[PDB]
Design a protein around this nucleic acid. Structure first.
Lengths: 83, 129, 25, 207, 226, 99, 126
RNA sequence: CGGGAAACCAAAGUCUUUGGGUUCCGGGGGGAGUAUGGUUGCAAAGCUGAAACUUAAAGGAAUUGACGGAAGGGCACCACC
């Protein structure tokens, strides 16, 4: 939200589900934020760098979060587009 | 029996969006459906789409982006005049800031905001937001 | 079975009223 | 991952073949179908062994991404996983629970047993169903070891394996401990490990 | 006695952090959608700005071998007149305990409220952003945007919650058994609550992620704490 | 309110089903509402068998079975304790009693 | 009649055995003297009932575990079933047979070469 | 899945984010399927079908008690052998 002077007027901007493009509400206690370690390419070891995803509670309780986290990890380089 | 094809196309998209599916299949295809989809795509509510030839009216596959709240049809194609269009957008839209009525006019199928620039009335087809 | 018996009671009263009026003229 | 330093070796494939990890049930749930090779002539499903190693490395990359190891919680209510979760939590500093889980451990703020973890790992989704359903009140991500007939309803990483009992359950916990210690830098990616798989197994006949 | 410190010591990770470090507002608790279970967290952030309102006190009873046994149920609403409101209910054997218990649950239930414009975007927002609705029992409640300076067009119960939420102008509608004040209050709070989770064209740009408070302060909870 | 999903009868995909007369009271009820019991027993009791085997003329004989099939209405089956009433969730169990 | 023991007796007896297992034995008249110096018990008649159930529990603990009670002597032999057993000096060896469809699954994974093979029955077992 | 007052329903769902086509049909409880006219029938009767007057509730789903010439366990010389 902006006004005609171009300044912003929301209290905060809420996050959206990485699998589904829908807003995660302030009381969605079934939702999660996932965090995953990157590894260096010469020795397969943690360098302290990481990647993150957020998942809606409605997609978790129907059983679709495992396949959603897998598609996200194949779209990024982690699973390397072969299986 | 199937009395109207545009009502099937929009009800099929609307049920697929609510289940969170990434694609949908529309059958039968029509010249009216391809022109209605193009108006939603130009305003940013759906992704790109592909048509299959089968020698019997054809089929369409559509890509969904998760932005669409609803799309729908008004079944009798009532006539509208520029003076009465305010009453229809007061009834059907969620806010004055977003959402669109779709009209058919002798200048083409179009968005209700374009019909005011072109100074033309027409018949109502449907809406999206 | 009170409703079925109230229906029977009305039918016998109507049979009496039928025969009583149609005798008059 | 694609890298040769993360590739599955012959000596690990022989340890999978020796423990029955690739043999599923007679039933398949529609959510598990992408992890399956084929159904045998006798009615049994074969789990794809390359699918397991990718999902196990993705699970280890989640476990390494927690900066305090005591924030990870580890569970088994069936006996075949109890020695295994106790050894896993000794090798890397997680919190074990073995036997009965008390309802409300994650949500009854006053309770003597109350705790508030950052990641949850469970041995069998059908058996360990209390801490899985209780995680839905507190924003807690989940890892689980799944067979062909396991119900996926709150798990975010499922690892395909035979979880019925014996050597197969103990081997999976040992191999998960090996790769979290490797990629955190505590042991070699090339020299063999000093801890034998047989330390994790449950109650073969003693004498 | 005198109001010195140590009336509170935390019992949760979030309570340990709020009392110590740079968690600077409720909005960074809402962004990660965390549960709040210590009432003193909301007195720390909003405090004496919150004002309090008893909607109804209601008797209820069960039959027994000896006599009818009666309890008192209190409905309480709370807010700061600038974007925050909450609703709470408790049932007890005595009215004073029911009101005192209802205020704690009305503080734990607080949500952020969205505001917008009917016309051109001059000044600061003053009405609901789009047409919204909520349900409870048979009761249905619906809220509609209005031009500047109309006030609230509603019955008494929904008007008090919309005033405490900090909304100036609103048109409203309702359906079925509004004579049940508890379902009418919850249908209104359900409509207000949905205002910040309706996807609208100004929210379409891609989300950028950050670490959560438990991850940024992961060492503060370990080095000197239990 | 409806008590049973099957209306207390087996009839699905049919209009009419023939009646039968009960073995206790001769009341008239449908063949698929009636409660069934098929009884197989010895002609000679477990106490009496030894006394009748020793007076037998044959070096080997096996005493015959008696076969009877019985039909009850709901009132006779309840009063003669063939069936009991059950808890609202227990009414759903279709498996016969244990042996 | 009724000789069932109430929770005041049963809880006090367990707490005594957890702390003083090395003092106790099978003689009731010696247990009755020990329980009088390690604890404050308000009544002579309650002291006799506590020493009675302690004497019953000692005769059970000499046979196997009691789920509510723990002692060092029983924990350190549990810790010897924990760690590693005397059973074998090496694992069960990886030389195991393979079915034709597992051979095909391993062929597509670029592996094999170390397993014997045989086929199952002509039709599904009934 | 989603819906509903709930019992419950893969339809009794895709509804205040309200419009696929089309037939019959309900409007607080009674008086009343009654009176009166028409019509069909050998008769019994079927079909169509009011008003004056009267009244603050009649009704649906579910909860806790009490009660049963309902069922199952257990007890008492203020019960019985």
């Amino acid at each position: 939200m902006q006004n005609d002077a171009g300044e912003f007027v929301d209290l905060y901007v809420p996050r959206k589900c990485s699998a589904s493009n829908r807003i995660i509400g302030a009381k969605d206690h079934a939702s999660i934020q996932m965090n995953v370690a990157e590894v260096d390419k010469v020795t397969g070891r943690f360098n302290g760098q990481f990647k993150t995803y957020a998942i809606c509670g409605a997609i978790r309780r129907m059983g679709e979060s495992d396949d959603s986290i897998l598609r996200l990890a194949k779209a990024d380089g982690i699973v390397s587009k072969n299986f | 029996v199937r009395m109207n094809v545009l009502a099937d196309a929009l009800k099929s998209i609307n049920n697929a969006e609510k289940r969170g599916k990434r694609q949908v299949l529309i059958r039968p295809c029509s010249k009216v459906i391809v022109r209605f989809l193009t108006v939603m795509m130009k305003h940013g509510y759906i992704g790109e789409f592909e048509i299959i030839d089968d020698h019997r009216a054809g089929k369409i596959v559509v890509n969904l982006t998760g932005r669409l709240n609803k799309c729908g049809v008004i079944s009798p194609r009532f006539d509208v005049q520029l003076k009465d269009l305010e009453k229809w957008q007061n009834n059907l839209l969620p806010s004055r800031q977003f959402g669109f009525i779709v009209l058919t006019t002798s200048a083409g199928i179009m968005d209700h905001e374009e019909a005011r620039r072109k100074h033309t009335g027409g018949k109502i087809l449907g809406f999206f937001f | 079975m009170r409703a079925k018996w109230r229906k029977k009671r009305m039918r016998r009263l109507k049979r009496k009223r039928r025969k009583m009026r149609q005798r008059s003229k | 991952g694609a890298l040769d330093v993360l590739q599955m070796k012959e000596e690990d494939v022989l340890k999978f073949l020796a423990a029955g990890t690739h043999l599923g049930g007679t039933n398949l749930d529609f959510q598990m179908e992408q992890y399956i090779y084929k159904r045998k002539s006798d009615g049994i499903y074969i789990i794809n062994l390359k699918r397991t190693w990718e999902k196990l490395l993705l699970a280890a990359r989640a476990i390494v991404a927690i900066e305090n190891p005591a924030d990870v919680s580890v569970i088994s209510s069936r006996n075949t996983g109890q020695r295994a979760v106790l050894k896993f939590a000794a090798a890397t500093g997680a919190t074990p629970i073995a036997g009965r889980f008390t309802p409300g451990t994650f949500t009854n703020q006053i309770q003597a047993a109350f705790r508030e973890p950052r990641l949850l790992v469970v041995t069998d989704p059908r058996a360990d169903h209390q801490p899985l359903t209780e995680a839905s009140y507190v924003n807690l991500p989940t890892i689980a070891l799944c067979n062909t007939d396991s119900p996926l309803r709150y798990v975010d990483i499922a690892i395909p394996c035979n979880n019925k009992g014996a050597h197969s359950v103990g081997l999976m916990w040992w191999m998960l401990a090996r790769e979290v210690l490797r990629m955190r830098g505590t042991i070699s990616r090339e020299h063999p490990w000093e801890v034998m798989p047989d330390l994790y197994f449950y109650r073969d006949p003693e004498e | 006695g005198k109001a010195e410190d140590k009336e509170w010591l935390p019992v949760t990770k979030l309570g340990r952090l709020v009392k110590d470090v740079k968690i600077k507002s409720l909005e960074e608790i809402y962004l990660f959608s965390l549960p709040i279970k210590e009432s003193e967290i909301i007195d720390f952030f909003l405090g004496a700005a919150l004002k309090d309102e008893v909607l109804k006190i209601m008797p209820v009873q069960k039959q027994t071998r000896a006599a009818q046994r009666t309890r008192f149920k209190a409905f309480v609403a709370i807010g700061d007149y600038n974007g925050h409101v909450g609703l709470g209910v408790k049932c007890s054997k005595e009215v004073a305990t029911a009101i005192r218990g209802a205020i704690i649950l009305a503080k734990l239930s607080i949500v952020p409220v969205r505001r917008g414009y009917w016309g051109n975007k001059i000044g600061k927002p003053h009405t609901v952003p789009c047409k919204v609705t909520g349900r409870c029992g048979s009761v249905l409640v619906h809220l509609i945007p209005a031009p500047r300076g109309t006030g609230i067009v509603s019955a008494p119960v929904p008007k008090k919650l919309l005033l405490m939420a900090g909304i100036d102008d609103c048109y409203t509608s309702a359906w079925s058994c509004t004579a049940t004040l508890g379902n009418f209050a919850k249908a209104t709070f359900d409509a207000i609550s949905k205002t910040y989770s309706y996807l609208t064209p100004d929210l379409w740009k891609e989300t950028v992620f950050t670490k959560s408070p438990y991850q940024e302060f992961t060492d503060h909870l370990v080095k000197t704490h239990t | 309110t409806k008590k049973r999903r099957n209306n207390g009868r087996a009839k699905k995909g049919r209009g009419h089903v023939q009646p039968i007369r009960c073995t206790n009271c001769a009341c008239c009820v449908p063949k698929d509402k009636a409660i069934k019991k098929f009884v197989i027993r010895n002609i000679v009791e477990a106490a009496a068998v030894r006394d009748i085997s020793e007076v037998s003329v044959f070096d080997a004989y096996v005493l015959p079975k008696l076969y009877v099939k019985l039909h009850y209405c709901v009132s006779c089956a309840i009063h003669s304790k063939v069936v009991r009433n059950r808890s609202r969730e227990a009414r759903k169990d279709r498996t016969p009693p244990p042996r | 009649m009724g000789r069932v023991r109430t929770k005041t007796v049963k809880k006090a007896a367990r707490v005594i055995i957890e702390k003083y297992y090395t003092r106790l034995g099978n003689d009731f008249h010696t247990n009755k003297r020990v329980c009088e110096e390690i604890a404050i018990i308000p009544s002579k008649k309650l002291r006799n009932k506590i020493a009675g159930y302690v004497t019953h529990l000692m005769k059970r603990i000499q046979r196997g575990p009691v789920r509510g009670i723990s002692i060092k002597l029983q924990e350190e032999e549990r810790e010897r079933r924990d760690n590693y057993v005397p059973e074998v000096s090496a694992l069960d060896q990886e030389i195991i047979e393979v079915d034709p469809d597992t051979k095909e699954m391993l062929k597509l994974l670029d592996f094999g070469s170390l397993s014997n093979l045989q086929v199952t029955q002509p039709t599904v077992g009934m």
